[model samples]
Every structure is written in C-alpha cells, then in structure tokens.
Target: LAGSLSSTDAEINRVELEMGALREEVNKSLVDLHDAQAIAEQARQDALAAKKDLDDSQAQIEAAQERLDRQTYLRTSAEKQQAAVEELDRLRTENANKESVLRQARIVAEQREAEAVEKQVQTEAAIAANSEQLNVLTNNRSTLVAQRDGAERNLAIARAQADXXXXXXXXXXXXXXXXXXXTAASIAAAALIAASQSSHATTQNPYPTDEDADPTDIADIQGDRSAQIETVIARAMSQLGVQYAWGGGNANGPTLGIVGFDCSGLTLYAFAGVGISLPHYTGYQYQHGTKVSPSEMQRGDLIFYGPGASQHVAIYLGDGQMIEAPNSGSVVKISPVRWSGMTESVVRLI
Candidate 1:
C-alpha cells in the first residue's frame, strides 16, 4: 500500500503539473487565435488596397499606349515636312527665274519643318516618360497582388488553427474528472491534503473575479497611482490589496476601471489594473505579462514584485507583498486574495 500510494502520489503530481501547464497552453492558444484573426483582417485590407493599385496601373498603361501612338504619328509627320521643304528647295534650283518665289516658299517650308522637328523631339520624350511610368505601375500592381495572395493564405491558416485550439480546450476539460479521481482516491492523508490545496490552486486558475468597481468610499482607500515610481509600485500593490475580497471575472478590465457588468477580474486583468495604478501599462495576457519588469528569483523578490507560475511563468501573475506573501486573482469562481507564495508543493522545484 505504501508503494502503491507513493506511485499514485507521483501520478497525481504529474497530473497536476500537466494541468497547470495545460492551462497556460490554453491561455496562450487563445491569444494566438486573436492575433491570427487580427492579422488576417489586416491582410484582407491590404489585398484590397493592392487591387486598387492594380486598377490604377491598368489605366496608366492605357494612357501610355495612347501617348506612344500620338508621338509616333508626330514623328512621321515631321519627316514628311522635312521632305516637303527639300522639294521646295529643288524647285527653286530648277527655275532660276522664279527663284525669289520658290525661295520664299522654301523658307516657309523649312520653318514648318524645323517646328515639326522640335515638336517631334518633345513628343518622343513625353511618350518615353509615360511608357517608363506605365512599366513601374505594372510591376507595382503585380507585387501588391502577390502580397494579397500571401496574406489571404496566412489568414486561412490562422482561422483553422483557432478552430482546432477550441476543440483541444474542450477535450482537456473532458479528461479532467478522470484525472481528479485518480489523484483523490490513492493519495495518503498528507498527500491528500496537499492535493486538496493544489486543487484549490487549480480552481483559482479556472476562476474569475467580480467585475464591479470598488465602493466609492475614498480614493485614498486605493493607493494614489500618480505619485513617484516606488510610490507607484506601492500604489499598484495597494490597489490589488484593496480588491482582496472582490469576486473574479473573466475578460474584466484594464488600468482605467473595473469590469462593470459582472464586476470582476481574471488573473491577468487583476495584474493589469494593479500595474495600471502605478501608471505602468501591461498586456492583459499572462504569457506576455510574464515579460513585464525585471525578472526576480524567489530570493530576490521584493514588495510589489510581480510573480508568475507555470512554464516560464506564463500561466498566472500575482503581486508580491514581501515576507513570501503575494496577492492574486486565481482562476474563475474565486476572490482576489493574498496567500503564502509557497502554498502548495505544486510550487514544484521551488
């Protein structure tokens, strides 16, 4: 029975670790889904912009073709004028008696021919410029179209992954009961107590806190956030402390205010609002929040330091309040509260 219990204990520990890790994974997956969707939408908008550029390119191509045709006609006309002037010169030479009349005609023809030559040069230059512009527009349109195609492909992949993530989360929940039974049935009394504590900790991970703002009793009740940096950090701690008994809410709030309707906060939201008080902005996702501030080892933790749990501390966040105590909004169906940082051996390797 001793070995049996010990083996069961190990299994329970393993399951607990898996559950904690899984929770963080689900949270991360949700974030990924949102980001993917946003990118896909942006891609779609870019694609539309590309198509408009393509249409403009087509218009430019048509205009350039017309300019080239007109320039070619002008060049031909200039050559004809040059030939006419030469013919007049020859006539003047053939009839010396009418040299004055033919000379005058020749002079007029030469002037027309010169004007035609100048006009032909200008038209050729204009046509070349238009043709070059047309070529650039055509290339630009093609590039944009290709970008649109790539963006659309990315969007489709994102959406599919999002769908799969949802199903995976549901499946994780379905397996929870069987795992819970295994741990509960075989655990020794001490082990059972530890498991109970871990179960509570897990509950925090799944819970949400109340959404309504704190009672309007006094602004001083919640620490002043607008002060100095240390004071700011203190204020963040104070605000989190003030919400100690508040119920949890999912998708609750930011630094501005509490989540009103259900009047609560989840783990990340609680952390966000607390840091918001200190005038520090943080993302409302645990994985990202883990990157906030200087990372401190357990020994290096100070008052107002943010602590995290899970792989790379990406699962949950809490505010450290010195003396190994930290405040957190654990999961759903729980209240904001302070607890020893070492509550469960779920502390694992701690």
Candidate 2:
C-alpha cells in the first residue's frame, strides 16, 4: 500500500509539472498573439500613413511643377525679349550705317544737283534723277530708324520677362524642395514602421493577406456648370501660382500632374486643372489631341489655342480680347499675350 501511494504521488507530481509547462506555453502563446495583433494594427496604420504621405508628396510635386512651369515661362519670355533687343541693336547699327551712307550720298547728290542746276539748261533729266535718288535715301533711313525703335521696345519687354522669371525661380524652388523633403521624411518613417509591422506580423500570424482599401480620383465637381466654375477656380488658382518656379515632370499618382523640383509647360497646365478634378495629359501634344477644337466664333472663355506646325509645339487657353494665356516654353511663364504670327495662323479648329 505505501509503495502504491508513493508511485501515485510521483505520478501526480509529474502531471503537475506537465500542466505547469503547458500553462506557461499557453501564456507565451497569448502574449505572442497579442503582439501580433498589435503589429497588424500598426501595419494598417503605417500603410494608411504611407498612403497619406504619398498623396502629400504628390501634391508637393504638383505644386513644384506649377512653379517650375512659371519660372520656365518667364525665362523663355526673357530670352525672346533679349533676342528682340539684340535684333533691335542690329537694326539700329544698320540704320546708323545707312544714315552715314545716305549722308555721303546726299552730299554727292547735292553737289551733282548743284552742278546739274548750274547746267539745268543743258540737263533737266540729270537734276530730276538726283532728286529721286535723294528721295530714295531718305526713305531707306526712315525704314531703318523704324526697325531700330521696334527692336528697342522688344528688348525692354524681354528684360521684364527675364526679371520675372529669375524672381520666381528664387522664391519657388526652395518652397518646393522643402515640401518634397517633408514628404520624403514622412515616407521614410512610414516605410520603417511598415517594415517593423510586417516583420513582427510574419512571425506570428498564419493569415497574411493585407486589408484592401479602394483608391479613386478625388471628385471636385458634380455637374457641367459646377465643372465650369471649378475650371475657373482652378485657372484662378493657377494664375495665383504664376510666379512659382517650374519642375520638369511631376504629378500625384492619383491626383494632379506633378514635379516637385521642376516643371515643363504641360506640368503646369496639368496641376492647374487638378483642382477641378480634370486630369490633364503629361504632354502638350497629347493634350492638344484630347480636346475638341473650338472655332473662333464658337470659342468659349476657356478654349484651347495652339501654335506651331500641326500644333506640335505650343498650347494656350483663349482668354478673349485677342489674347491667349500660355506657358510659352522652357524659359517662359504662363502669361496672356497677343496671338502673334500670321503663317502660324490659328487653325480656328472648331
């Protein structure tokens, strides 16, 4: 009987030990499960934060692009003006030369006339011919002076464009870079958090599929009239952004066209339209093809105007008053200008 009791006691002790070990394992499992849950939650938050950060980054990029576009436009205008100035200078020089030539010609003609006048009884035709030559020289000098004046005016305009562009670049580039840095920092932090969550979750969860989130473009307008108003609002917003420096290629993945550091002509236009939920093409050539042409008579306040052969080069919005607003080129800004060029006549494409 004693031996049996001792054996029973031993068995009971063994069972107790086994139970203790099992309970400890259960506790550890619970802890691990709790940790996994926490990690999953963190992962979800991190993903959401990453999405936000991406969105913000995209916004910054778009803003930067718009600014870049503006700066580019200003620069281009400046160059054009400078070219005009140079042309004027050349014409002025030419005019001065012609004036000198004409003065000498006048002297010769006058001397000949005087000689002819003295011999007028002998040569009426020579006197008349000298008068005609003097007339021609006078006309040529006048033409040269006119050309010189036109060139000077063009130079002044170009200088103004240069100043505007330089000013925009100085102020907008820093702002854009700062925003981009913020977005990058936020993204990095979010990515690190995600990595931590993913790692921790991997070790604990049998389930691995991530939760789905639907991402769609933001709608800013609901109706055609609303769209029109939105368009104006966007255009106004773009107008406000006129002096901002441009980025090369920029945009939000699901939002606006963007380039946080630089903008080309189309980048500016794309972002400007984003405010209205009107997505624009990244390239102007594509954009030109996207919209239906508006005839001059049928053109609304926001009709698109194109310049260049087959409209391969430029696009602008018709702002009435025989003016169109455009981000002219790589060194230009969005501005309203007279529709210049006569062979480059707008196709009045309706």
Candidate 3:
C-alpha cells in the first residue's frame, strides 16, 4: 500500500512538471505572435501612408498638367513634347531601378525560404529520431518525450510558414508578367517610348529598317525564315554551352532559362533563341499545342516538333540541320538525338 501511494505521488509530480513546461512554451509562443502582430500592423500603416503620398503626388502631377494645357506660355509645341519625352525617359529609368530592387528582394526571400525548407527537413528527421528514442524511454519519461515531440512540431510549423512566405514572394515577383491587364498600357508606353527614341535618333543616326519585304517577311515564310535563323544561332550557342546543366522544369515566356544553373527542354529552346532575341514557353506539352503545325514532309527550319507514345506531347525542336535537343525522361540530361528516335514515342510528329 505504501509503494502504490509512492507511485501515485511520482505520477502526479511528472504531470505537474510537464504542465509547467507547457505553460512556459505557450507563453513564449504568445509573445512571438504578439511581436509578429505588431510588426504587421506597423507595415500596414506604412503601406497606407505610402499610398496616400502617392495619391498626393499624382494629384499634383494632374494639376501641373492642367496648368500646362491652359497656358502654352513661352515654349513651342516641339519643346514641350521634347520635355515630356525626357520626363518619360527619366520615369523609365526609375522604374527599371525599382524593378531591380524588387528582384533582389525576391532573391533574398527565396534564399531564406530554401533555408527554412532545409531546417524543416532537419527538424522532421530529428523528431523521427526522438520518437524512436522515446520508444526506449521508461514509462516515467513518456510525458517529457511527448512534450519534446510537440516542440518539434511547432518549429516545423514555423518553418513551413517561412516557406509559404517565400512562395508568396516568388509569386509576387512574377505578378507583373502574369498581368495581362498591364499589357495594353505597357504596349502603349513602349510604343510611345520607341517612337520618341527613334525621333531623337533620326536627328543623328541612320535608320536600320530592312530594305525589302523578303529580307524579313511579316508572313508565314518570313516568320519561318526569322525563326530558322534564330534556331541556328541558338544551336550554335548551345554547343558552346556544352557543360551547362539542364534545369528541370525551367524556362518561361519571358526568360529562356528557368534557373541560372539548369535548362529544361523548353528552357533550352528559350535560352537558345534568346541567344538572338526569341522567347519561348515553359512546358513541352504546351509548346506542342501552341506553335504552328508542320508535317514531316513540310518540316522547316526552327519548327517545333513533338513526339509521344500517343498524345502530341514531349516536344523538341526540328533543326533543319537534321538533329534535335531534348530534356529526356527523369534522371537524364538535355541531349541531342536523331529526329526519329525510338521509345514509347511512336508518332514521328514534325
């Protein structure tokens, strides 16, 4: 009866100790959360103030524009237009600088997220090890082991939050490209800028427009010709880039390489054409669907031809030179092979 009473007292002591530790941990978490909330509120207020300031500046600009329209005081129309042109140039330079800063922030955020992922992986491994260790722990140590597991889980959750933030940063950085709404405004501004620059250049430089239509066609033949030349340039460049690693699932419509160190199939195509000035898509399956179709007999230079066991997927370039580069299956590097290589790739899609 005395021994039983002693065991009950020990169990009660262990429970009290665990509850104390848990309370401390909860307090720590609460403090961390409060700090985060404060930071977020501060950031929110700063953003709001910035917006207000921007609104004021825009209003001032509009007022100035209205006044300028009202009285064409001393300057000629040409002089006014030239000043506006210069202002536009300045704005473009500033925007470029801001975009560069945003890009840098994106890189830093991505690096941090990658570190968080590594940390989470390590934490998971540690937890698994601890769980195994807990299996060997005496009954009296069970509560401590469980508490340790809870702490590991909490840290893992924090790491996941960091990863989620990193993903958001990446997506935010790409938001501009994904924005079709900006396309019209951007095109207009780009056209205006180009015209203004061309006008400026005309006063001092020779025009570089083509002498003839056939020299650079605006039709299929012209498109084919231009694409062919671009392909050749890219292929030559790729040969020079012999040792560059192919990044899996790399490339985008704006960028040829998905990442700095690797090239996916489409990424390779993009980087190759980017050797000149052409940009391509991200996926082979998508490429097969979008590009102009060509038959084996009608295959022309730079034609994107895809082959698959069934569906028209697994795309590759139809180099008029009789070979193609591909991001083969998993565990393979981007490689050059015959136009009609065998595998499950049954249909010889050109």
Candidate 4:
C-alpha cells in the first residue's frame, strides 16, 4: 500500500506542470490577436480621414471659383458702363456745336428781314413824290387848253377888224433886226425842279490781273508757310470775279444768286473759308479782324476798306493798286482801282 500512494502523488505533480505550460501558450496567442486587431483599426481610420480631407478641399475650391465668377461679372459691367458714358459726352458736345451753327444762321435771316423792310419804305416814299409830279403835269395840260381857246377867240376878233389894225399886229410874229445902242442890262435867274428816275446795269468785263510776267521765275521764301493758303484765297476770289453783286449775300460754302450774291465782304469771306478760316459777314467786323500793315506794303489777299472805321466798303486786294469790289447798287462785281480819294489813311488789313 505505501508504494502505491507514492506513485499516485508523482503522477498528480506531472499533470499540474503540463497544465501550467498550456495556459501560458494560450495567453501569448490572445496578446498577438489583440495587436493585429489594433493595426487593422488604425488603417481603416486613416483611409476615412483622407476621404474627408479631399471632399473638403473640393468644396473650398468650388466656393473660390464662384467668388471669382461674381467679381469678374461686376468688373466687366463697370468697364462697359464707363465706356458708354464717354460716348454720351461726345454726342452732347456735337449737339452743342450744331445748336450754335443754327443760331448763327438765324441771325443772318434777321438781317435780311431788316434790309427788306427798309427797301419797302424807300419805295413808298418814291411813290408819294411821283404822285405829286403827276398832279402838276395834269394842271399844266388844263392851262394849255385854255390858252388854245383864247387864241381862237382873238383870231376871230382880228378877222372882224377887217385886217386893218396893221394886219392884227401879226398874231404870229414880226421878224425885225434891232441892235442895242443904249445901256447894257444883266439878268440873274434861278430855277427849281423835281424829277424821279431809276436805272441799273451789270458789266462783267474782268480786268486783267497785272502781274509782272517778265521777271524770272522766283522761288518762294521758305518761311512764307502761309503763302499757299494765301494763294488759295486769292484764287477763290478771282474765280467769282464776274458774279453778280448783292447787298448782304454769299457765305463760306459758295456764292449764291438773288438776295445772297457776292457782296465785297461776302466774297472775301468765301475766299478765306477755302482755307478753313471763318470770317464775319459785316464789313466793319471784317475790317478789324486782321493784322494792320501799312498801305504801301499791301500784299495780295489783304483787305482794303473804304471810308472811316472801314464801314462803307471792303474789297480784297489784287495787289499792285487794284482790288475786286462790289460797287454801287446799280453795278455788279468789278475790279476797281483802290480809291485813294476817300480811302481813310487807316487802311484796314482784314
């Protein structure tokens, strides 16, 4: 029995040692499985985080593009609006210029109206004077008729007197030669009369422009830059040499017929306009508009005005003591010698 008990104890100890070794192996395995699970969870979290960041970046980029689009639209609209405003300003300026030109044309029309009214008044005055002359002529006719009847009566009486009274003293006349042998007598007489008349004419014989052709062909001065413009103005004036004369006629564009024909100043204005120079219509205004050189130093295209203050007449100088003029009411455009008689020493250089 003792021997059997010892063997049984030894068997129990061996079994206990084997059980401890199996438990250690099982704990190691559990630790290894837990570490692998932690690795897998870490990988999953990293993938999810990357996806969220990419979505957020896309959203931000889309938002920035929308902002850029809105700003670009506003800027484009602003630029276009500014350009439109500039165009509007330009149009307004052009309209203002048009208005000014229209107003000037109206002023010329007013001048024409005034001239017409004055001419009508003068005509009425002439009619009144002529009517008085007609009445006087009618009275003279009555006197002549009475004289004829008296002559007939006297002749009848002379016939009754039987041609005895020295042949009625010759009711006709007795031609007798008589010489004065006595004192000489002197007589003074004065008479007054009224007569009405009207007449007009137009002579278009253009006087030759007397330029010295015998002189050698001379080269123009280099500094005389305005000579070209001067030549053009002179040519324009020469072209209208034979145009009809008018009181307040012609303009910058061209010569006109009827009421707007080539007045002296009007022709000058038209000629100057050939080179884009604007001139006033009034003779007085034109006279005071240019440089005043001495009369002796007058050049072609210089204006020579007649009367004081350059008011009466204005003519374009054709140089060499000659000028083109629209002379009196009865004459047309003609070339006339510079009238030194009435010309004021203050020769205007318009």
Top candidate (TM-score): 1
Q: Give the TM-score of candidate 2.
A: 0.24
- Over 4 Å off in model 2, which ranges? 1-150, 153-229, 232-249, 252-294, 297-350
Q: Which regions of candidate 3 fall more than 4 Å away from where they truly are?
A: 1-6, 70-77, 88-350
Alpha-carbon TM-score of each model against the true structure: 0.30, 0.24, 0.24, 0.29
The deviation in Å at residue 210 for candidate 4 is 56
lDDT for position 54 in model 3 = 52
Error of 3 at 103 (Å): 13
In order of lDDT, best first, we have 4, 2, 3, 1
CA lDDT of each prediction against the hidden true structure: 0.31, 0.34, 0.34, 0.35
Residue 314 lDDT (model 3): 26
Give the poorly placed runs of model 4, Cα more than 4 Å off. Answer: 1-225, 252-260, 274-282, 291-294, 301-306, 309-319, 328-336, 345-350
Best by lDDT: 4
Candidate that beats the other on TM-score, 3 or 4, i.e. the better one: 4
Q: Of the pair 1 and 2, which is ahead by TM-score?
A: 1
**Steric collisions counted per model:** 23, 29, 4, 0
Sort by TM-score, best first.
1, 4, 2, 3
Q: Tell me the tens digit of each residue's lDDT in model 2 across 172-274.
A: 6546533432333323432333333212111233322343452321211101434443343333333233332212222321111112212222232332332
Better of 2 and 4 by lDDT: 4
Give me the displacement of residue 232 in model 3, in angstroms. Answer: 77
Model 1 clashing-pair count: 23
**Better candidate by lDDT, 3 or 4:** 4
